[PDB]
Amino acid sequence: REHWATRLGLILAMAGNAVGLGNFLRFPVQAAENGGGAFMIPYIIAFLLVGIPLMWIEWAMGRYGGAQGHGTTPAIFYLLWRNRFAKILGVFGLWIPLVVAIYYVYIESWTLGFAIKFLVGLVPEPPPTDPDSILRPFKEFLYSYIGVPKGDEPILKPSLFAYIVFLITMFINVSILIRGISKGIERFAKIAMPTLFILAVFLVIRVFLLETPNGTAADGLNFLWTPDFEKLKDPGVWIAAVGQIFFTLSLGFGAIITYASYVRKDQDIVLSGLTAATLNEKAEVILGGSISIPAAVAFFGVANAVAIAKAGAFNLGFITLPAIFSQTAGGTFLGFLWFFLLFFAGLTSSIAIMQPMIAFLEDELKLSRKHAVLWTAAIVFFSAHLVMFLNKSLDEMDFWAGTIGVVFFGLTELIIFFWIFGADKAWEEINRGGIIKVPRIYYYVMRYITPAFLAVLLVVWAREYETHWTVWITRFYIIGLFLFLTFLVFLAERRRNHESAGT
Ligand SMILES: CCCCCCC[Se][C@@H]1O[C@H](CO)[C@@H](O)[C@H](O)[C@H]1O
Ligand SMILES: CCCCCCC[Se][C@@H]1O[C@H](CO)[C@@H](O)[C@H](O)[C@H]1O
Ligand SMILES: CCCCCCC[Se][C@@H]1O[C@H](CO)[C@@H](O)[C@H](O)[C@H]1O
Ligand SMILES: CCCCCCC[Se][C@@H]1O[C@H](CO)[C@@H](O)[C@H](O)[C@H]1O
Ligand SMILES: CCCCCCC[Se][C@@H]1O[C@H](CO)[C@@H](O)[C@H](O)[C@H]1O
Ligand SMILES: CCCCCCC[Se][C@@H]1O[C@H](CO)[C@@H](O)[C@H](O)[C@H]1O
Ligand SMILES: CCCCCCC[Se][C@@H]1O[C@H](CO)[C@@H](O)[C@H](O)[C@H]1O
Ligand SMILES: CC(C)C[C@H](N)C(=O)O
Ligand SMILES: [Cl-]
Ligand code: NA
Ligand code: NA
């Protein structure tokens, strides 16, 4: 079985797994929608009581499974719990990352296309003071790129360029994945991570240089880092915070587990996991939180910035920010840097969310790396057309897989690993070979606090939380996908059998 060549490579690979579009696109919006500072407290708490422990747990399960030649949850869950229902539940470990990849890769392709067009200077030309006269051109830019519906039909009409760019994006993901773990994901990580850091820092500085009659970036920072204790009793804020934690730390996606399955049986996972998580958090609250929000607040003020954040999920990153940059000298190239950053983050995450499927095809169905990668890319590519041509399909997929699925699957994996498999055994497995030991209290946090916290979370959210019929188009399909995957697992367990009878 493949293994991470170096420690640094491992750390940067995991960090590249976590640090993605969620840091620079999702976080700003989530924090802005929930009152900025009022969103941080729960966030921080969610990081301590959920993020860290689940990270460690997934690292542990990953390494454990990898020691026996398994990297995906269908087999790992069965190793931890000898029950068919464990395999069935394990299917989600492939389903979630697949579905998420299906749209994630597309958004990534967006970032790539924008990078290209901004580099060549093929961008909108806003009339040199009316805010709408400046934003409108960019909004039209995006809408024309992805093909936002102009009528009543829920149909998207992506430009030829966007499609070709998606093709190329897929080709790059494949070019990285086909070289494997050490020569592919690791090697690339060692470049993309530094590059990403540099770009992010530069952008942060440039943004900090912004000042208008409406305010400065410091106002944005203040908006983001000022506590509001009157929202601590609001369930919604907590739900948002935890969701953001899950998404940003790649928890419940089966990606961390698969990546960890390539860590040598003896190699530490405590300090490594903690370091990756910490890196992601620094890239999120410090870098991702000091770009979009501070700029939007500097140019429009707090209220208007919040309004923009609530507008949508892509408004701030693909429309507002580039529009703001266009008002400065070298703003186009600045936009280029922005979208390039976004592209690298995206890529480094996407490869991570396709590696699970690849690893299932390799480990369980005994496919070669080439064939596994190619078939995975085929499934993703084909499935992506639904996201490309059906309006709000992306939203549905993101809700069922990227929101519900990750939390439910987190609770599931926690229950299987720390309850069924054994709390003491799980603790032992986690701390084994650790450069540092997990604080004693975290035993009680993992066994009692985290599971109850989640459970309560899911129950409250489901109880307190009207769509277009076309949603059923997506659901259906993804459901199918699940079934598909299930069947594969079946085939797998059959092959195993036939293999056992022959040995
Ligand atoms: C390096 C080659 C990159 C240039 C390819 C651009 C193909 Se995208 C091109 O861009 C125009 C400006 O937004 C759009 O209005 C037009 O509709 C679209 O075809
Ligand atoms: C998920 C199923 C998606 C397959 C639909 C393929 C669209 Se087919 C092709 O595509 C263009 C792009 O919008 C259309 O405008 C054009 O009218 C149509 O001929
Ligand atoms: C899997 C169902 C077949 C889907 C056909 C592939 C998309 Se069809 C492809 O799409 C581009 C982007 O809209 C169009 O601009 C181009 O004219 C059209 O040929
Ligand atoms: C490297 C990025 C890929 C660049 C692909 C550009 C080819 Se897409 C570009 O879009 C125009 C708008 O329809 C077409 O009329 C034109 O023929 C076509 O070249
Ligand atoms: C899965 C999402 C399906 C949307 C793809 C539509 C391709 Se284009 C679609 O084609 C129809 C004729 O077939 C036209 O009447 C309709 O106005 C046009 O939107
Ligand atoms: C940056 C990573 C891709 C994120 C794409 C957003 C999925 Se779409 C976004 O998702 C929200 C869920 O929090 C919905 O509430 C919101 O209405 C929808 O626009
Ligand atoms: C939410 C959990 C907070 C994590 C804070 C961990 C610092 Se807890 C720290 O851990 C040491 C090793 O167990 C103990 O010996 C020491 O007494 C205790 O202060
Ligand atoms: C689904 C995950 C790969 C997302 C990633 N952790 C991000 O923050 O962008
Ligand atoms: Cl375009
Ligand atoms: Na992240
Ligand atoms: Na990434």
Sign of CA pseudo-dihedral 25, 26, 31, 33: positive
CA of 280 relative to ligand 11 center, distance in Å: 9
What is d(CA 375, CA 365) in angstroms, rounded to the nearest whole number?
12
Nearest ligand to the CA of 346 is 11
Inter-residue contact 412 to 89 (CB < 8 Å): yes
Q: Which atom of ligand 6 has the smallest separation from the CA of 243?
A: 13
CA 246, 251, 254, 256 torsion-angle sign:
positive
Residues 124/140, Cβ–Cβ less than 8 Å:
yes
Cβ-contact 134, 327 below 8 angstroms: yes
Which of 319, 242, 299 lies closest to 44 in space, CA to CA?
Answer: 242
Q: Whose Cα sits closest to atom 9 in ligand 2?
A: 157
Tell the residue number behind the tokens 């129950």, with chain if given. 459
Measured between alpha carbons, how far is 332 from 334 in angstroms, rounded to an integer? 5
63 is in an annotated binding site: no
User: Ligand 2, closest atom to CA 163?
Assistant: 12
Q: Alpha helix locations (H) across 210-284?
A: 217-224, 235-248, 255-260, 270-281
Q: Where are the beta strands (DSSP E) in 111-180?
A: none
Q: CA-CA distance, 220 to 295, in Å (whole number)?
A: 7
CB atoms within 10 A of CB 495: 13
- What CA–CA distance (Å, rounded) separates 402 from 194? 27
Write out the two tokens for 189.
């990580």
Intra-chain end-to-end CA distance of the chain, in Å: 21
Phi, psi of 488 (to 5 degrees): -55, -55
Give 227's Cβ-side CA count (13 Å radius). 5
Q: For residue 96, with 0-12 CB atoms within 10 Å meaning exposed, 13-18 middle and 19 or more buried, which class applies?
A: buried
The dihedrals phi and psi of 216, each to the nearest 5 degrees, come to -130, 180
Q: CA 169, CA 181: separation in Å to the nearest integer?
A: 19
- What 3-state class would DSSP assign to 155? strand
Question: Which of 155, 163, 382, 476 is the best mutation target for the ligand 5 pocket, counting ligand atoms within 8 Å of the beta carbon and taking the most?
Answer: 155
The rounded Å distance from CA 88 to ligand 2 centre is 36
Token look-up 């022959």 returns: 502
| DSSP class per residue in 81-100 | S-SHHHHHHHTHHHHHHHHH
Handedness of CA 188, 331, 313, 52 (dihedral sign): positive
**What's the one-letter identity of residue 105?**
V
User: What are the sequence ranges of the domains in the chain?
Assistant: 1-503
Q: Which is it for the CA torsion 97, 100, 103, 105, positive or negative?
A: negative
- Residue 449, ligand 7, Cβ within 6 A: no
Token pair of 373, please?
């990668």
Eight-state DSSP code of residue 433: T
Q: What is the DSSP letter of 390?
A: B
Distance CA 411, CA 142 (A): 37
Helix (H, G, I), strand (E, B) or coil at 368: coil
> Which residues make Cβ contacts (< 8 Å) with residue 355, sequence separation at least 6?
177, 185, 255, 258, 259
Q: Tell me the C-alpha distance between 45 and 64, whole Å.
A: 28
